[PDB]
Amino acid sequence: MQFVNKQFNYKDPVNGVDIAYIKIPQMQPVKAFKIHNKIWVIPERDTFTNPEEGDLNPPQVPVSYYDSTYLSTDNEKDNYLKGVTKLFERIYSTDLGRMLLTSIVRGIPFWGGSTIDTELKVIDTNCINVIQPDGSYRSEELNLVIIGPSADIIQFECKSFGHEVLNLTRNGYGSTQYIRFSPDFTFGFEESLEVDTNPLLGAGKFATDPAVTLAHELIHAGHRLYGIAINPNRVFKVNTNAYYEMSGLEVSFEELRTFGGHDAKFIDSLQENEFRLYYYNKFKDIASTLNKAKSIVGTTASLQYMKNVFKEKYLLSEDTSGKFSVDKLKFDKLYKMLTEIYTEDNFVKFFKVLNRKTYLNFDKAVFKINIVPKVNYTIYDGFNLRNTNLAANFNGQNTEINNMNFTKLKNFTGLF
Structure with missing residues (x-):
């Protein structure tokens, strides 16, 4: 059962519904695909989300790649759409990916826009403006946008619009997430840990499966949609790699969490418990806010429907009178799902790929x-195509054996 029911072509005609020109919250409209x-995909370079990032030229850090012309032609946009679609299908074909994508679709950003307690209202920056067949705009709520990268082509990241006073990614509410991502490039890594973690060694023998990379960003998106991301100011001042220490490199707890495995264990039990309590408190604030709302703002959805949406998102308890509360057992279960089950390391296990450790x-x-092309990569096997030389030993990811699938654009080793 497929996640994406249409195999869109970039040149398919607009219909104002799932193929449309849109604006995100001056810009010209961009063609987008639902x-x-x-969940929408915008096959354009992201010159939109950040005013300080409006062009595609270099300002270069070792790990960066620039080409202002990438993703400018219709054929590239067609291939971008198809590649992103394939990666969604590869993710969804795993039990873990289906779980994550279900959580994402259920994670409607909270209707926290009202400054009148007795009214419940959408936040406009959790919507896009869609050009209808008559040329006028309508507002559509959404959870996730996949967009092309900004100037640095390989700076993938999950970002979102803020609110003037609310911290939407960290107060339980959530916000529509924009993932800067390309399926057209991937990283090389080394199979020996002592080489991979050394900045002076290795040329990148193995290629990362882009499905893992997209999954990583989706995991961030899950956290951010549920408003449980860890503040990026909470970091591990890394002291387990001499090269990291020499450069003072700090890694956010949020990244370590998302990777999972042993990385997540650098967040100690006391800090885990702190965050769990902090976010539990946020879910309680949401239940309280829902209970104060006696009317909805707007005409599109009923109060009782939206209260049900948020009951299902946050797994709230509802008494007969209609009052919500947070069950600490269900909260812990959902919080653990989002933070410990959905991890990069777990995805690696489901995709049966080689990956950074x-x-x-x-x-x-x-x-x-x-x-x-299916001759290159499939939903079911990635690069490691069954019943070929590429099936065994991650040979499809081996850039020296499957060399026709990889062209090296830049070496980072030596530049750190």
Whole structure:
């Protein structure tokens, strides 16, 4: 059962519904594709979300790649759409990916826009403006947008619009997430840990499966949609890699969490418990706010429907009178799902790929790839195609054996 019911072509005609020109919250409209309920793809470079990041030229840090022309042509946009779609299908074909994507679709950003306690209202920056067939705009709520990268092509990241006083990614509310991502490039890493974590060694023999990379960003998006991301000011001042220490490199707890495995264990039990309590408190604030709302703002959804949406998102308890409360057992279960079950390391296990063993490494290279052709990459096997030489030993990821699938654009080793 597929996650994306239409195999869109970039040149398919607009219909104002799932193929439309849109604006995000001056810009010109951009052509976008609704691949699933609450999820859109915009095959454009992101010159929109951040005013200080309005062009595509270099300002270069070792791990960066610039090409102002990437993702400018219709064929590239067609391949971007197809590649992103394939990666969603690869994710969804795993039990873990289906779980994550279900959580994402259910994670409607909270209707926290009212400054009148007795009214419940959407936040406008959790919507896009869609051009209808008559040329006028309508507002559509959504959870997730996949967009092309900004100037640095390989700076993938999950970001979102803020609110003037609310901290939407950290107060339980959540916000629509924009993931800067490309399926057209991937990183090289080294198979020996002592090489991978050394900035002076290795050329990047193995290629990361982009499905893992997209999953990583989706995991961030899950955290942010549920308003449980850890403040990026909470960091591990890394003291387990001499090279990290020499450069003072700090890694956010949020990244370590998302990677999972042993990386997540650098967050100690006391800090885990602190965050769990902090976010529990946020879910309690949400239940209280829902209970104060006696009317909805707008005409599109009933108060009782939206209260049900948020009951299902946050797994709230509802008494007969209609009062919500947070069950600490269900909260802990959901919080654990989002933070410990949905991890990069767990995805690696479901995809049966080779991958970096830790976030605390040094990237070796970037490669240009093309995952669209089935002769190159499949939903079911990634690069490691069954019943071929590429099936065994992650040979499909081995850039020296499957060399036709990778062209090295830049070496990072030596530049750190």
